[PDB]
Symmetry: D2
Subunit: 247 residues, 4 copies
Amino acid sequence: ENEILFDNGQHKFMFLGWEEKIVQTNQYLILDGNEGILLDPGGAHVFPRVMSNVAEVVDLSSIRHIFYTHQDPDVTSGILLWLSICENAKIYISSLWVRFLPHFGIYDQKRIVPISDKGTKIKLLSGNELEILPAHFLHSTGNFVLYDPVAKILFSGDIGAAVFEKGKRYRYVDDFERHLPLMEAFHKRYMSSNAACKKWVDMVSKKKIDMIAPQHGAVFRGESVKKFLEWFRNLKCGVDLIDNLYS
Amino acid sequence: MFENEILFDNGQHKFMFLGWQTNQYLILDGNEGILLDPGGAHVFPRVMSNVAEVVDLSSIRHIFYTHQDPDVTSGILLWLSICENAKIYISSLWVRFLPHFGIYDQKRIVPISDKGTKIKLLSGNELEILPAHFLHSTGNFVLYDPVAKILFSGDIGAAVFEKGKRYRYVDDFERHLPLMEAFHKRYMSSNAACKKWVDMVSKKKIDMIAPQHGAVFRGESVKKFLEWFRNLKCGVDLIDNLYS
Amino acid sequence: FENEILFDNGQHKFMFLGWEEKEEEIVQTNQYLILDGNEGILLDPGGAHVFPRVMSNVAEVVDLSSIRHIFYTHQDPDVTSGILLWLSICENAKIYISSLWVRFLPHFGIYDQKRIVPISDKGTKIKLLSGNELEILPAHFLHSTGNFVLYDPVAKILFSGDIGAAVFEKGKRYRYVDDFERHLPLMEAFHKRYMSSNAACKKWVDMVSKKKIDMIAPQHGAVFRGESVKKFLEWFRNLKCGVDLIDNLYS
Amino acid sequence: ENEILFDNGQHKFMFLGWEEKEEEIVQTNQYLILDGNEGILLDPGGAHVFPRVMSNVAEVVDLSSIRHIFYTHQDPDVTSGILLWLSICENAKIYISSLWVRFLPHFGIYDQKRIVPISDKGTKIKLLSGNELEILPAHFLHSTGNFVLYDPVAKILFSGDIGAAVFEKGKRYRYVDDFERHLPLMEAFHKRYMSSNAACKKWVDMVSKKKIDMIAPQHGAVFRGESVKKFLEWFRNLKCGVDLIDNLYS
């Protein structure tokens, strides 16, 4: 049941899945001209189905960029598979993490772009940009988000992640306050501090963002883009609550 | 080269630093062994061979991991399958990535709560697993051995050496400190987290601090590190310089 | 489609586990389980790809700590991924494998062989706590260099591995061979390409045909019962295969 | 370290160095054919030896000019390394027996846009220069689907496990210069693994039509000089496999 979150001729932003059946994980795909961009593609456990859902929309040889927000252990199993099935892809991972690439069968880094802490920009043959923005400590030590200025969509990874209730999945947040309880425990335990959340929001508030797309949970649209950014900005998380940790 | 080293010993309780970037530690107590962050699948044939060489692998009874991935999560199923009597200690935050590593039976998995726990040994001695979250991992722990008075600190106090110039002990803190500063400023989450950790840790007796990478703190360098780390501006404190 | 009982006398069951369909699909693999007293025996359990659900299907029938023997006919690449997984979830199991390959087990994460039983070329006997036995009989070159079948004298069932294996068509799977000649198109090409020689087929047929066999249970395909048991053994003994066709292979 | 087995300026056959100054496993040979500016790997090592085999190859040729990788049959480990080689040699096609391509998913191989499945009759790799490599049938010697590779320019037969030997503890050597002291390292494996004398004879008779300066096995030492014709005569009369089956069925 794929979905188009944006479409202008050169540029589609796609929300694939799901199935009927592990947490729920989302898969997103950007089509721009004759190249594809994978966002946090599924690791080895889910790999047969994610790859077929992908080959179903775009030639796997036209995948030209694969971006990883961070080193989840269930995405890290898949780097070598994606590398070996998408010969034309560069793989983008944080430079903090590239030393572990041998430990995954990656010994040649000629298609590995280690992202600097300040971030970077992917430029495509069409002439459109993707912005990989710093998002460190939310939650991983080296962590990034991806902003598509053509589509006006922020791929947030685990920022805005939610875990659904028992068989009550849904794809879009149209009522923020009823969505928040699926979010709150994860964000307080995992996000490093309110200082980190305020800095990240103050940065994403300068981009034109119609939709925030997390890696788990529902896609934020409409009025929940504002509401999530406010809630996140004032959130006490992580070290702010570290006396209840350790306790 | 790589003769083993004894950091503590009385006949009944030994704390060992194995030879060969990454350090390997082994606590022997009575007839139990305790592995501390043993190497993952790439180093496994000789790390496993080096341990079996000091202690029978069926008397390994506890394997402790400060935090998860990839230097060591390649190895959890291997250590599980070659140490039939071991319990594996890992943060509860990560135990449901365990299927994705072929670990489907969790009857020998001890998921550590955020407040930590204690390993009690048949001898009646204890090991204290103390919280160290956000230094650097979201779920992170250190191990305190009260008999030997040694803190196994994981990456807290880690150093990356120059060239082929590794050494085992920091006997001069200030000449060692530059090998530490970049890592700790980039990785440790905030000074608030370092200050909270030092204040709990400094209530214990610590003759040595043993990190997972780098040199072991002994002598007066143990106090110098705890005071330096307590005042360290790290991580989110430098976040406008991370960002740009 | 549920699990099925091929034999039961109170203390001894031979189980043919049901299929999930849920295609998959090519072709399906069978899982069998022998329960004797309070101990279980797995026959060629699936490797790592099928392992989560294969393991749950077994755990639903028997406590995995009661599995005490795991037998592999031969060294399919589908199963060697799972040897370490089964070792770790069946703490009391010894696994029986061919000695030709016991030295290459490190390449699959198996370094301690205190629960590895290397089967010599003669075969061996699994003795069960009750005092019943399973007989591991030689089946070398049908097809792999080191290969075995398992004969259950209590249940009168031969677990044949790949001998008698069949590949089903798209949506035409079925559990039992009640019409041998209709089953033959699903079997014949494989056996002619894989089984090494008619000389090997004759030796194996003459050995197994001295045992009392109500059913033949292969690792892929349908279970032979009734008249198909002796029809299959007769077909197999006269089969021209493998090196007997080597001028047609080479060309 | 690496060795040159043939050279005419434009065509080489390499016997790559090993290992490892000290022994590991009980180990294997790696071969490399250079023709024009394109490379051919012969049974490159699986994942455990992959860091070392990969760097040894990069020392002789850019991994981007590897265009053919040939596998005699499957094991693993050699099947452990296919995904690694596929991902490090962009331009290589992998040649494997058609019996074996169904196990490819179970090793992470999902898109066979770069898999060249060999039919039982064999095939010829045609190189850009116009030279060829002959993939010749060798089925049941020992594996069900099995092939050898013959290089007509270099006059070298890469034999896979045919002619394989396991060395004694710390007495490895690179060349068979005396067949008879080499034979004890070989015969138990061949009598147990090779399917029948009938299979050995057709293969020797097939192979005897080629000019063979040298037989290069995957384990053991390379046959040269008088060992070649000594090996082919021994292998031709060998009682193996099913011929010895009533000791296997007492």
